[PDB]
Design an enzyme around this catalytic site. Sequence first.
Site, short mmCIF file in Angstrom:
data_model
loop_
_atom_site.label_atom_id
_atom_site.label_comp_id
_atom_site.label_asym_id
_atom_site.label_seq_id
_atom_site.Cartn_x
_atom_site.Cartn_y
_atom_site.Cartn_z
N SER A 77 0.76 -1.26 0.00
CA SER A 77 0.00 0.00 0.00
C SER A 77 0.78 1.30 0.00
O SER A 77 0.17 2.35 -0.21
CB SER A 77 -1.05 0.06 1.12
OG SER A 77 -1.31 -1.16 1.65
N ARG B 241 -0.37 9.19 4.97
CA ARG B 241 -0.79 9.02 6.36
C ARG B 241 0.03 9.89 7.28
O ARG B 241 1.22 10.14 7.05
CB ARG B 241 -0.55 7.55 6.84
CG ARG B 241 -1.37 6.51 6.07
CD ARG B 241 -1.27 5.17 6.77
NE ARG B 241 -2.12 4.14 6.16
CZ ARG B 241 -3.42 4.01 6.46
NH1 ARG B 241 -4.08 4.77 7.26
NH2 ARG B 241 -4.04 2.94 5.88
N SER C 299 -10.20 1.86 1.51
CA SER C 299 -10.65 0.98 0.45
C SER C 299 -9.68 0.94 -0.68
O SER C 299 -9.38 2.03 -1.30
CB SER C 299 -12.08 1.40 0.06
OG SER C 299 -12.46 0.64 -1.06
N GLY D 66 2.48 -0.24 4.42
CA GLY D 66 2.14 -1.11 3.29
C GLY D 66 1.95 -2.53 3.77
O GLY D 66 2.72 -3.01 4.60
N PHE E 64 -10.06 -11.77 0.12
CA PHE E 64 -9.21 -12.34 1.15
C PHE E 64 -9.93 -12.66 2.45
O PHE E 64 -9.27 -12.53 3.50
CB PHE E 64 -7.95 -11.48 1.35
CG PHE E 64 -7.26 -11.16 0.03
CD1 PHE E 64 -6.80 -12.19 -0.78
CD2 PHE E 64 -7.13 -9.83 -0.37
CE1 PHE E 64 -6.17 -11.90 -1.99
CE2 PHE E 64 -6.54 -9.52 -1.61
CZ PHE E 64 -6.09 -10.59 -2.40
N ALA E 65 -11.13 -13.09 2.39
CA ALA E 65 -11.93 -13.50 3.60
C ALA E 65 -11.12 -14.64 4.24
O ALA E 65 -11.02 -14.64 5.47
CB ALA E 65 -13.28 -13.88 3.10
N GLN E 66 -10.55 -15.50 3.45
CA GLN E 66 -9.67 -16.58 3.92
C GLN E 66 -8.32 -16.21 3.29
O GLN E 66 -8.20 -16.18 2.07
CB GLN E 66 -10.10 -17.94 3.50
CG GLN E 66 -11.54 -18.23 4.06
CD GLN E 66 -12.02 -19.54 3.47
OE1 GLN E 66 -12.03 -20.52 4.24
NE2 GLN E 66 -12.39 -19.57 2.17
N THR E 67 -7.34 -16.00 4.12
CA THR E 67 -6.02 -15.53 3.71
C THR E 67 -5.31 -16.36 2.64
O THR E 67 -5.03 -15.84 1.54
CB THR E 67 -5.05 -15.25 4.94
OG1 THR E 67 -5.77 -14.29 5.75
CG2 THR E 67 -3.74 -14.66 4.48
N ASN F 97 -0.23 -10.85 7.63
CA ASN F 97 -1.29 -11.58 8.38
C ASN F 97 -0.81 -12.07 9.74
O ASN F 97 -0.99 -13.20 10.15
CB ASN F 97 -1.88 -12.71 7.50
CG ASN F 97 -3.17 -13.23 8.08
OD1 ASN F 97 -3.98 -12.40 8.52
ND2 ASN F 97 -3.37 -14.54 8.14
#
EC number: 3.4.16.4
Length: 347
Positions: free
Chosen positions: A62, A285, A160, A300, A120-123, A327
């Site tokens: 990011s 940021r 987002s 990121g 990515f609900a499940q990595t 994660n």
Amino acid sequence: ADLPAPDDTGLQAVLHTALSQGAPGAMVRVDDNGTIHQLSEGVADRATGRAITTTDRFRVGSVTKSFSAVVLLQLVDEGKLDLDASVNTYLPGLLPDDRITVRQVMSHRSGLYDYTNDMFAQTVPGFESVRNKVFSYQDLITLSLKHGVTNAPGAAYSYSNTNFVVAGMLIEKLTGHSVATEYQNRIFTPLNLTDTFYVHPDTVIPGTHANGYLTPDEAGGALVDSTEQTVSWAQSAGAVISSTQDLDTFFSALMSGQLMSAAQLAQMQQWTTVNSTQGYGLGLRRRDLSCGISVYGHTGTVQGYYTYAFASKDGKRSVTALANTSNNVNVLNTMARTLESAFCGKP
């Protein structure tokens, strides 16, 4: 005023802690007004055992948003874009609401749903599904648009990825060139960022690099090598490759005024509140540190890499920290401490 001295022993402890929490490797580089601090611990490739070093290239995730924002702000300087015009003015029929403006998209105030929550609900499964796929910008926007907006235009901050997919589309429509070309001409070349690349949809990281290790959702699970992927799901929201030196150069150049007019840099720093200690500008940021200094840059995340790239208000001190896992909230939280040690110094 000026800053306390960076705390190298504090930085060493942060890196050590991150390793104990699951990062195969971690490193940090501080450019303190011409005096370098560099520390690393652990491995770049947990299978061959090659040690990570501060010169290793990696996926900045990011942090790419800041690169996209700079290109758009230069387009504002050139009179090709107006921040308060509707996105639909430039990209007819793209969004369901003509009131969503470029400024709202840049500051995550558009209400556009983040398609990565679906992906990515499940990595690990989500990673395996997209790693070798190539998406157009429209594909991702369409994914977002299957959901309603989450808030009225400009009403609130909601991070987002869709916003920076839109940014990529805008850059390409206004310039007639790929975002790779624009990054190269406007930022990589002028700053001489020789370790920075945008190679989408190529899956290889050029030169010597740290491998990325995705932590599975289940505790105790084996790490997945996530190094080589298209990053097509992120593109202008997350596909830049760089190094600690180049991100330090980039943020120092940004904050010192070298990348756009003073008027657009001021626009970039118009903060929207994120939480009690953070703000978001236009692809930038703001983090408020315990010693009462604020730093500016971007975090990121991309599979297997967590990056912190921040600089002081005048650009004289810049820091880039990287842990080659993702994660893993413990690692993410511990790595943020590099900012305290680098900018606030010894407690």
